[PDB]
Design an enzyme around this catalytic site. Structure first.
Site, PDB file in Angstrom:
ATOM      1  N   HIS A   2      93.975 -20.052  47.238  1.00  0.00           N
ATOM      2  CA  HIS A   2      94.321 -19.743  45.443  1.00  0.00           C
ATOM      3  C   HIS A   2      95.082 -18.520  45.702  1.00  0.00           C
ATOM      4  O   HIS A   2      94.979 -17.743  46.385  1.00  0.00           O
ATOM      5  CB  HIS A   2      93.326 -19.746  45.314  1.00  0.00           C
ATOM      6  CG  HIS A   2      93.473 -19.397  43.820  1.00  0.00           C
ATOM      7  ND1 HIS A   2      93.636 -20.336  42.977  1.00  0.00           N
ATOM      8  CD2 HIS A   2      92.650 -18.491  42.571  1.00  0.00           C
ATOM      9  CE1 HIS A   2      93.673 -20.230  41.195  1.00  0.00           C
ATOM     10  NE2 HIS A   2      93.055 -19.233  41.090  1.00  0.00           N
ATOM     11  N   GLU A  20      91.592 -24.467  47.568  1.00  0.00           N
ATOM     12  CA  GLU A  20      91.012 -23.687  45.971  1.00  0.00           C
ATOM     13  C   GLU A  20      90.339 -22.502  46.082  1.00  0.00           C
ATOM     14  O   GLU A  20      89.528 -21.542  45.247  1.00  0.00           O
ATOM     15  CB  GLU A  20      91.290 -24.773  44.268  1.00  0.00           C
ATOM     16  CG  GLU A  20      92.236 -25.272  44.224  1.00  0.00           C
ATOM     17  CD  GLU A  20      93.812 -24.229  43.469  1.00  0.00           C
ATOM     18  OE1 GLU A  20      93.496 -22.847  43.361  1.00  0.00           O
ATOM     19  OE2 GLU A  20      94.911 -24.664  43.424  1.00  0.00           O
ATOM     20  N   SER A  28      95.898 -18.520  37.637  1.00  0.00           N
ATOM     21  CA  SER A  28      94.640 -18.476  37.505  1.00  0.00           C
ATOM     22  C   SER A  28      94.641 -18.003  36.113  1.00  0.00           C
ATOM     23  O   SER A  28      95.334 -18.936  35.523  1.00  0.00           O
ATOM     24  CB  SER A  28      94.637 -17.792  38.873  1.00  0.00           C
ATOM     25  OG  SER A  28      93.225 -17.587  39.171  1.00  0.00           O
TER      26      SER A  28
HETATM   27  C1  LIG Z   1      93.173 -16.409  38.790  1.00  0.00           C
HETATM   28  O1  LIG Z   1      92.669 -15.497  37.507  1.00  0.00           O
HETATM   29  C2  LIG Z   1      92.950 -15.368  39.540  1.00  0.00           C
HETATM   30  C3  LIG Z   1      91.826 -14.612  40.894  1.00  0.00           C
HETATM   31  N1  LIG Z   1      92.438 -14.047  41.689  1.00  0.00           N
HETATM   32  N2  LIG Z   1      93.899 -14.438  42.363  1.00  0.00           N
HETATM   33  C4  LIG Z   1      95.236 -14.269  43.028  1.00  0.00           C
HETATM   34  C5  LIG Z   1      95.955 -12.984  42.491  1.00  0.00           C
HETATM   35  C6  LIG Z   1      95.818 -12.486  41.025  1.00  0.00           C
HETATM   36  C7  LIG Z   1      94.500 -14.018  44.403  1.00  0.00           C
HETATM   37  C8  LIG Z   1      93.507 -15.449  44.951  1.00  0.00           C
HETATM   38  C9  LIG Z   1      94.280 -15.789  40.609  1.00  0.00           C
HETATM   39  C10 LIG Z   1      90.999 -16.313  38.270  1.00  0.00           C
HETATM   40  F1  LIG Z   1      90.309 -17.532  39.777  1.00  0.00           F
HETATM   41  F2  LIG Z   1      90.702 -16.866  37.529  1.00  0.00           F
END
Ligand SMILES: *[C@](O)(c1cnn(C(CC)CC)c1)C(F)F
Ligand SMILES: *[C@](O)(c1cnn(C(CC)CC)c1)C(F)F
Ligand SMILES: *[C@@H]1O[C@H](CO)[C@@H](O)[C@H](O)[C@H]1NC(C)=O
Ligand SMILES: *[C@@H]1O[C@H](CO)[C@@H](O)[C@H](O)[C@H]1NC(C)=O
Ligand SMILES: *[C@@H]1O[C@H](CO)[C@@H](O)[C@H](O)[C@H]1NC(C)=O
Ligand SMILES: [Cl-]
Lengths: 537, 537
Positions: B438, B324, B198
């Site tokens: 995601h 996603e 992410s």
């Molecule tokens: C990315 O950084 C993100 C936001 N939440 N997550 C996960 C675990 C940290 C949970 C879905 C990743 C964001 F999308 F940019």
């Protein structure tokens, strides 16, 4: 008593017994007249019924073909000559053919063929339409009719002497002849299935709308043609201009204010001069003289009849082929799609072809077409860009209009059967890349593979028997399926308004899908119209 | 000699031997400082290196988490609390963790984790990131770092006291610590693989661009994140306004002409007050404080670096999950997608959601989105309209940006490996309709299923072993594939510039496809931009 002499409501006629390529015998009456010859003052006008005759009229010879241009683009290429008139050309062409099985039935179902050819060409006498196999293998009466094509059949000026739709009134009179007479040949006049391909399917569908034809037949089969296709009708205003353009091109008076002078001069011209001068600047799948809304055969556009439910309540069987577009592109972009093996299209050639094949839409619409018809797995692939040209022409001009018609019929509670025809003959004479083109199913519907002197494989003979059985089951009962489910005859499910199932017709297949091509049809019927609206400032 | 005491370039530290959940033993050093605490006058500013210390620093306790909002929207729901900080919140948070196998290697590969959380949340100490399983099952050194998030990490005003990208300079400083020190723990500093998910993947990709990070690592793994994502960066002009809005929201001077007054007040505010007041009117997947183009960490946008080939020449492994979008819609459209079983979306609700989820595009663009994301086999199906929402959010904000980055890398001659992760855990606590969201692959990448106190099936344990093996093979050699072809380890082909193959990661599958989702990605990256340009008079 001679069973080959039949007393019709206008006189006696004599037929002849002949052999099917099948080994079975049939009785045949070729060239039965059903109208006065539409010559002299009767040119462009609706047909009059035929005058009574004394004696026995010998109806044993295939009739004249209506006057039309002959296609010579590819010389004696068999893929082209099979669609050219094979009997003499004449304005004296209004005839019917009847073919009955042996022994003669009492109340057989009747399959009545209406040929296609873009409303400017075609004839019931073509060898590919030979009726004998279908009649003898399926025990149905098979009938075919001639009707006027080109400006001789569809000239419109909005005057009583050029009222439009003469060729459709021809078909209507032939339908009336069949109801008055077919029982004398062993047919049940309450069991007439119309079937046609292309402009013949459009014709069939227009009989599903017209109040003049409503009681003249029972059900309909429509191969690769629908009345919502953009080439199926022309506005009255545009038809008048095309007629006047034709009058100008052949040296006649052509003033919008004195239509009497134009029609009278046109009635004096040689008929071959008329049909050979119809071809102005027209895009792909634009035919100069086609049906109009006249006030009597039709009094509203097909789409208004469909929207309101004003159409015949009956079953229909209909479908499309996988490469509907190539045939017309081959004749229109003669430099790009040469009739040779191994043709491909570059991405830059594809982008130019998109503009040539949709010459009426703005830039934003062209972008959408390009996006919709690109293989995004491999945008520059020269096979993909060639196939994309077939698909955008076939979807817009053929497949999506067949879907729309079948959909509205199903929504109104009628049983509908939808096919996608995917079989390419081993002996197809066109280049391999053309696939399964417009019209390819006709040979199998008429049982040509059962002629052993042609080159068809044993599997193709079986496939043709299956297709004749589906078609004639549908004509006899409203359902192509047999009673006892078979391994050779897969189940053909109904095309419901919500489900839109279709059966794939091919050699090693019984696949059932939805649509076909629902996403691309939504592009043409829903997305592109609203994008054109939004961008027409 | 005490193998748990290590002499770093700033002093001695003492670690501790512990068990992985599996029972295998690893050595561990938690909470190694790598910067001065960024407190007082140092808030918002780039990190200074840590001052030398005498003695032995016991590095055995998990470090503080950087100050950030705590998510309470769903109470004690485990699907949400697994992402909340599990250690005390502090501005004193700039620490590294190191985990080494037993027996200690000499020159092992080093996997360096950078956590995600939308640049406003996250911490290296989360239980789901526990390093012990990965280090001990795969024989790699596993390193993780804290970095400042939210306005404390990414405030930008265009002045030296708020220059932007503090959190990125934190990561860079930690990279320099690893290169200067990791050989003392048994790692090869020429074999550092960055991996992140992410916003951590965006972070990794920015180290592939920056001249300051270019020589600090060998290769990169990017899970569901790309520097071309629309949320990945903000313009300098817009970042300045967001900083000034934050100053106003907390009672500070906020005049564009005296930025010194605004920064100084902000430096006096409680850190929890700052992160809790960042959330104005922002659409879905729009995060208030994120990287900018600053002049020193980056001096041009990522898309300009990609277009010109100015990026590190190395292998990358990257990929996406099938659902996603849902995670973010669940938190944004809280009335429409309630976190319950059996949720569906009506066609009328879908049409309204399209406007709420793409609030910046004109009427013509929304129409195109609707057409692109309708199931034309069944347009009103309430499941199809719900899934369409995930797909349009996931395609635009995640999947299509990963594709773009992998594509550029491959065109420039680098080996690329692309995955589509499709596995839903049997114990997933989210509603069944959320699919594979995601972040779901993180548990398997870190080997959580091998924890015998948890509920993972034996099949899921094998799958996790496979995924760790691919990831660590890639870190060790640049190729996730093993030497001896296996039945349990399918072939993972390269993602070439024209083939674009990807491997599906799932339980009973080895499917190889193209893309993924090349057509929908072409819609967002090629069609919609040219349609927006044409219709904005
Ligand atoms: C990315 O950084 C993100 C936001 N939440 N997550 C996960 C675990 C940290 C949970 C879905 C990743 C964001 F999308 F940019
Ligand atoms: C339709 O009438 C049509 C034109 N040619 N065909 C066949 C055989 C007549 C060969 C492609 C059908 C026209 F498309 F409207
Ligand atoms: C019709 O056919 C018969 C033979 O079957 C023949 O005697 C007669 O002359 C024919 N009529 C005409 C007009 O040729
Ligand atoms: C028909 O399809 C099946 C499906 O695999 C195949 O095994 C069979 O050989 C096919 N027969 C043909 C193509 O003649
Ligand atoms: C660190 O660990 C040792 C025990 O191993 C202990 O004696 C010492 O007091 C601890 N604390 C510090 C600050 O060193
Ligand atoms: Cl009616």
């Amino acid at each position: 008593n001679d069973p080959l002499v039949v007393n019709t409501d206008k006189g006696r006629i004599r037929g002849i017994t002949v052999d099917a390529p099948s080994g079975k015998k049939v009785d045949v009456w070729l060239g039965i007249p059903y109208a006065q010859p539409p010559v002299g003052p009767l040119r462009f006008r609706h047909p009059r019924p035929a005058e009574k005759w004394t004696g026995v009229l010998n109806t044993t010879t295939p009739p004249n073909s209506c006057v039309q241009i002959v296609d010579t683009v590819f010389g004696d290429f068999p893929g082209a000559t099979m669609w050219n008139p094979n009997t003499p050309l004449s304005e004296d062409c209004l005839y019917i053919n009847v073919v009955a099985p042996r022994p003669r039935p009492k109340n057989a179902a009747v399959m009545l063929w209406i040929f296609g050819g873009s409303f400017y060409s075609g004839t019931a006498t073509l060898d590919v339409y030979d009726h004998r196999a279908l009649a003898s293998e399926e025990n149905v009466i098979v009938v075919s009719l001639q009707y006027r094509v080109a400006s001789l059949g569809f000239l419109f000026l909005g005057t009583p002497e050029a009222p439009g739709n003469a060729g459709l009134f021809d078909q209507n009179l032939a339908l009336r002849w069949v109801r008055d007479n077919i029982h004398r040949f062993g047919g049940d006049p309450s069991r007439v299935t119309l079937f046609g391909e292309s402009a013949g399917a459009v014709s069939v569908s227009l009989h599903l709308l017209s109040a003049l034809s409503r009681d003249l037949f029972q059900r309909a089969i429509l191969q690769s043609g629908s009345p919502t296709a953009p080439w199926a009708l022309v506005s009255r205003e545009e038809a008048t201009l095309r007629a006047l353009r034709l009058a100008e091109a052949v040296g006649c008076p052509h003033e919008p204010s004195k239509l009497s002078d134009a029609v009278e001069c046109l009635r004096g011209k040689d008929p071959h001069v008329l049909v050979n001068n119809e071809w102005g600047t027209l895009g792909i799948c634009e035919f100069p003289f086609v049906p109009v809304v006249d006030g009597a055969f039709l009094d509203e556009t097909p789409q208004r009849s469909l929207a309101s439910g004003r159409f015949k309540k009956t079953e229909i069987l209909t479908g499309s082929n996988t490469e509907e577009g190539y045939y017309f592109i081959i004749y229109y972009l003669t430099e790009l799609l040469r009739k040779e093996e191994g043709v491909t299209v570059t991405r830059e050639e594809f982008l130019q072809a998109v503009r040539e094949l949709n010459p009426y839409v703005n830039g934003a619409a062209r972008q959408a077409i390009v996006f919709e018809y690109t293989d995004w797995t491999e945008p520059d692939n020269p096979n993909s860009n060639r196939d994309a040209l077939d698909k955008m022409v076939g979807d817009y001009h053929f497949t999506c209009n067949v879907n729309e018609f079948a959909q509205r019929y199903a929504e109104e509670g009628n049983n509908v059967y939808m096919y996608l025809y995917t079989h390419r003959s081993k002996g197809n004479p066109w280049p391999r890349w053309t696939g399964v083109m417009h019209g390819d199913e006709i040979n199998y519907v008429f049982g040509e593979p059962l002629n052993p002197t042609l080159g068809y494989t044993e599997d193709e003979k079986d496939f043709s028997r299956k297709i004749m059985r589906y078609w004639s089951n549908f004509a006899k009962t409203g359902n192509p399926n047999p009673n006892t489910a078979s391994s050779e005859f897969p189940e053909w499910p109904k095309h419901t308004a919500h489900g839109r199932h279709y059966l794939e017709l091919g050699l090693n297949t019984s696949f059932v899908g939805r649509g076909p091509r629902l996403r691309q049809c939504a592009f043409w019927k829903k997305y592109l119209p609203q994008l054109v609206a939004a961008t027409s400032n």
